[PDB]
Amino acid sequence: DVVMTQTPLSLSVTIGQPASISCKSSQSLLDSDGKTYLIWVFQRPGQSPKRLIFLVSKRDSGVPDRFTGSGSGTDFTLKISRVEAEDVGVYYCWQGTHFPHTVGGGTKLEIARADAAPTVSIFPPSSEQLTSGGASVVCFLNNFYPKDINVKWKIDGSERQNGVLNSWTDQDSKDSTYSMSSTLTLTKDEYERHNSYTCEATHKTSTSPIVKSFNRNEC
């Protein structure tokens, strides 16, 4: 099997800056028919891949001319003359000259943006979940940067680490920020025995934590 090696594996770029992804194959991709079967594929997380370049340098329809593929033999390059927000995702070089067709490990591209503090939202349990016996308090930390953030839940002052499910989105293709969702799950009984629910976030954009609290029987 022809091995496809991509460098770098992780690519962090500043908007407007150029970028270059290298793809090396363990054997030559020059086919007897004079053509080289090397394509570049793009995939945004959780979506079908899309092809960008075929035959080393031919751009697919709709692919912006900021993208250039070039190379021959065992060395290929994909250059982005100027990176834009929508370029975030994974890039793969893939060869079809030899059987079996093989693919590179992928290069994940991410945009290095200006810092942005999160906006915290809190949602007490719906009356529907409550009637079904459960109680989930949800906290959304929206549109922040960088991705690294820490969330702590407090109930009437005391920290609670059990029953917390966290999830981050991938980098937004429009503003380049991240968002996070943190759910604290309790039984209806534990929920109703307390009054204040606090979602605190530690982020580099602030010296102290950004906090959002909610008191029952207040609003």
Binding site: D1, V41, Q43, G46, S48, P49, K50, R51, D60, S61, Y92, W94, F99, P100, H101, T102, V103, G104, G105, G106, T119, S121, I122, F123, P124, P125, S126, S127, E128, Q129, S132, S136, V138, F140, N142, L165, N166, S167, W168, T169, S179, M180, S181, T183, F214, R216, N217, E218, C219
Partner: protein, 217 residues
């Protein structure tokens, strides 16, 4: 571009067999070859092999010979990928792709597990205390306790596409939890209805929950 329809998610026991399908709505697949790609959770793409759908003649990558079987019924415009003696290693998303304008299917998520299919409980999340940021309000939707993946979540049947954040599902004790938030200008809600539409193909569950203003909390 996504122009091919693939079968819905599959949950199958280890050791069993499963057949995935790939069809097209606006054209006959007999003229263009179809190739199958496998993608394991958080890993790259793997090429399974390809097939000439007109006559069903195909070629498989060494690693899949004996595990995968490809056929194509050109009377019903469908290409099939049958996988046998499934293991945890087979858990992945499978894509078909046609040699016409780079058409791809949407993918079929196959989960090899002996856990039971469980439908999600969907809960509307309305903001409290008049919370707004700038002049916008954020609403949410909690999809809790389903198995297996995936769950399709849309806002207002898909028309409400901007300002949506769907958080990747998280596995906890054989059940997944997923949440989504939508931010709209405060002129829009609650004057106009906001509905969270959730579909869980594996249990063939469909639910729409309207996000209504809270009563006293």
């Amino acid at each position: 571009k996504v122009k091919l329809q693939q079968s819905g998610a599959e949950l199958v026991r280890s050791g069993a067999s499963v057949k995935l399908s790939c069809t097209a709505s606006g054209f006959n697949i007999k003229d263009y070859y179809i190739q199958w790609v496998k993608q394991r959770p958080e890993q790259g793409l793997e090429w399974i092999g390809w097939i000439d759908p007109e006559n069903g003649n195909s070629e498989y990558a060494p690693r899949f010979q004996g595990k995968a079987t490809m056929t194509a019924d050109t009377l019903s415009n469908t290409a099939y990928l049958q996988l046998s003696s499934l293991t945890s290693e087979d858990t992945a998303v499978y894509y078909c792709n046609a040699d016409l304008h780079d058409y791809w299917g949407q993918g079929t998520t196959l989960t090899v597990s002996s856990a039971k299919t469980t439908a999600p409980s969907v809960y509307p999340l309305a903001p409290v205390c008049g919370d707004t940021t700038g002049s916008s309000v954020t609403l949410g939707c909690l999809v809790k306790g389903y198995f297996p993946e995936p769950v399709t979540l849309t806002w207002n049947s898909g028309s409400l596409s901007s300002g949506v954040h769907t958080f990747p599902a998280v596995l906890q004790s054989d059940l997944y939890t997923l949440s989504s938030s939508v931010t709209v200008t405060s002129s829009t809600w609650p004057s106009q209805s906001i509905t969270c539409n959730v579909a869980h193909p594996a249990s063939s569950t469909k639910v729409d929950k309207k996000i209504e203003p809270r009563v006293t909390s």
